[PDB]
Amino acid sequence: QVTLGVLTDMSSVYADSAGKGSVAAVQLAIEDVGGKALGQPVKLVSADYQMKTDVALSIAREWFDRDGVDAIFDVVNSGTALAINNLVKDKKKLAFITAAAADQIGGTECNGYGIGFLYNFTSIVKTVVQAQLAKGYKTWFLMLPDAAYGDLMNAAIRRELTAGGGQIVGSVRFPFETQDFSSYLLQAKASGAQLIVSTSGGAANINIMKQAREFGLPSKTQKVGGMIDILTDVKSAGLRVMQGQEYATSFYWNMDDRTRAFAKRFYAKMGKMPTNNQAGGYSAALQYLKAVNAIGSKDPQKVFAYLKTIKFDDAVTRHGTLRPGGRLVRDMYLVRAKKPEDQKGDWDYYDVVATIGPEQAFGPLSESRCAMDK
Ligand code: NI
Incomplete structure (x- = not known):
């Protein structure tokens, strides 16, 4: 059985932009693989570490050791993300950091287990x-x-x-x-x-x-x-x-038809539009589950190897590839806050005004600070 863990903030200042919303985004990814991995229901657990790194580590430890958790998602503090990055190396589990932007994830602290799947x-x-x-x-x-x-x-x-x-x-x-x-x-x-x-x-x-x-x-x-x-x-x-x-x-959320369709599913659960963190959680969980099912194994080393051979093109991740060190590279966007008289509904805040390709947005493989990318 595959068990997913959403490790986030549900009580403090990131609760609205990650939190219960990130759980909902992972729920949506589980739906997009028919609810199943390796022929069994996918299990989902979540917890609030209250932006305390020690609490996040104690929660994650027990998750891996007692509750059979295979992969964790979100992590909204960069500091906490670096600590979790070091734990998953030790425990041999995957962590998809989808709510923190530290370059060290899939960069200088790359290890084959911590994956950066938002942006840096x-x-x-x-x-x-x-x-x-x-x-x-x-x-x-x-x-x-x-x-x-x-x-x-x-x-x-x-x-x-x-x-x-x-x-x-x-x-x-x-x-x-x-x-x-x-x-x-x-x-x-x-x-x-x-x-x-x-x-x-x-x-x-x-x-x-x-x-x-x-x-x-x-x-x-x-x-x-x-x-x-x-x-x-x-x-x-x-x-x-x-x-x-x-x-x-x-x-x-309002970039294109594919972002809007994902956003409508999300709104139905949460009563608001998804943030880029919550969207990242969706995409990481989707590609993780698709990989497990594709190779017929939840062995992290085998999932990681496979994820390096795929071109990612889902509702959230566009022109995505996973570099040898575990950093997702992808299209990025420049968004502009709209004039107030142009706002047509709740959450209608931006226009997309530029799109920068993955190689340009993340730099060439030679600029990477990860040893595994050379
Ligand atoms: Ni294209």
């Missing part, structure tokens, strides 16, 4: 760089949080923008829990950059976009840009505030 931070940056440069936005100014996420995005943006022929004309860091962003916006405007990039999400990005308007931004010469698609941020803040900001994403 590098692909977010490559996608915004290439899409914006193609639109003529050459000169950039970065607004970054103080924390490790800001360090990571600063290094990646600077390397990819330069490799593409653009230039950073300035940068600023703001401290934890900033509410007044006037000083940072004034510096961004004075830099003269064509593109002013608010790199974070959450209340920080929401207040930056609110306050950018008091400074006449966007203007004829300067646009405000973003990084990560956080659909629930647009829901909270509204298109009046968010209109015009662009982000990179792996998935948007």
